[PDB]
Structure 1
Amino acid sequence: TLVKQLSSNFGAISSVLNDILSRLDPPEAEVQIDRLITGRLQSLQTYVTQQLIRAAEIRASANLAATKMSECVLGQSKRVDFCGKGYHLMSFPQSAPHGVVFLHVTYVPAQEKNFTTAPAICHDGKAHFPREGVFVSNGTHWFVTQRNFYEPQIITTDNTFVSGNCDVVIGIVNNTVYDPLQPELD
């Protein structure tokens, strides 16, 4: 567009300086030269302004790309939906013409299942809470498993901690907690 704007009159009699010079005397010629100069100056200024406005957006995109290089490639990020979709594991950069490509590796769970759950287990007038995980039941028995993957385990005093009585907690369920020290003692 900038190059093509060089064939416009902008009100003058011609778009060629040499034709204006040949077909007119100097005092009248300068009047047309001024019109051409004004038009071409306006075209240049428009080009420069739009170039600045575009460079600002390019800078913002480059800043985002630099932050992503710092936080997805040189570390593991906990920011949600910043480094791919899912639970971020690691990223690999690639170089593209005037750009960069990030390959994000994430962890997606699958194949979920129904379970029954309780907040605490009441045993011997004491309330037990899971140290790290959740209480689940398959219908007849109770286990404790980690939250993001199903691996049931027997409820003992090594998976739980005691805090208070059974009267306060809403939804406490009766069950048994196995003490590993007693069988070895006896």
Structure 2
Amino acid sequence: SNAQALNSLLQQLFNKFGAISSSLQEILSRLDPPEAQVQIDRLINGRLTALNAYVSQQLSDISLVKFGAALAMEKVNECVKSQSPRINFCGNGNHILSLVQNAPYGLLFMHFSYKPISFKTVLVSPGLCISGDVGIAPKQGYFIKHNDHWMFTGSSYYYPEPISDKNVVFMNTCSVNFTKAPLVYL
């Protein structure tokens, strides 16, 4: 784009703009100065208009690279040096981390993400209601049945674990549509 803009700006000197010649040295002996002034005025006006248009285009384009650099600074601050609780900001998916490298007229970010490859269908429950009429809800995961026992599993990997106090949230009153299990004492 820069090369095309420079070429378009350079090609403006070869136009006539309504005059009898595109060059300035050509009309200096074949025409009198009182008659060459009008011919030079057209070229001057055309070249000034072209320069003004180029200046306006450049001033309009600078804001885009300014916003891009601001976004790059924010990305370096919130994706490289640290990880902020923002979804689909650094990359697209389960973001882990990112690295930064230098790129011609910019920067290059390399984001690493967690992608599953095999799935397994299971039956889950959003929460349980246990003996003291108390509700237990998984923090990040689900409650499943394994070997006729209520166990806990993660939301991104299938690995049955025993229910403990470090992976559940307690509530004094359980909801109306919670699974009743008056045998899980915790």
TM-score range relative to shorter protein: 0.7 to 0.9
Match in the other structure for 2:26? 19
Instruction: Quote how far apart the aligned CAs of 1:59 are.
Output: 1.1
Q: Which residue of 2 aligns with 1:134?
A: 142
**Cα distance in 2, alignment partners of residues 10 and 158 from structure 1:** 81
Structure 1 residues 135-144 or 93-102, which shifts more? Answer: 135-144
CA distance in 2, matches of 1:164, 1:50: 65
Unpaired runs of 5+ in structure 1? 180-186
CA shift digits 1:81-128 (9 cap, x unpaired): 111122222111111110110010122344332222334444445334
1:150 matched residue in structure 2: 158
Q: Displacement of 1:72 after TM fit?
A: 0.6
How far 1:71 moved relative to its partner? Answer: 0.8
Q: Does 1:72 align with 2:79?
A: yes
- Work out the CA distance in 1 between the residues paired with 2:34 and 2:177: 100
Is 2:143–2:151's contact at 8 Å kept on the other side of the alignment? Answer: yes
Structure 2: tracts of 5 or more residues without a match: 1-7
Deviates more, 1:106-115 or 1:90-99: 106-115
Per the alignment, residue 182 of structure 1 pairs with none
Question: TM-score of the superposition, structure 2-length normalised?
Answer: 0.81
1:82 maps to which of 83, 89, 97: 89
- Whether the 8 Å contact between 2:128 and 2:137 is mirrored in structure 1 is no
Q: Is contact 2:153-2:160 (8 Å) kept?
A: yes
In 1, the alpha carbon distance for the partners of 2:88 and 2:157 equals 21
C-alpha root-mean-square deviation of aligned residues, in Å?
2.5
Residue equivalent to 1:183? none
Q: Identify the range of structure 1 (104-113 vs 15-24) with the bigger mean alpha-carbon deviation.
A: 104-113
Larger-gyration structure (1/2) = 1
Q: Would the aligned equivalents of 1:118 and 1:173 in 2 still touch at CA under 8 Å?
A: no
Note if contact 1:123-1:176 (Cα within 8 Å) is conserved in structure 2. yes
Find out whether 1:33 has 2:5 as its counterpart: no
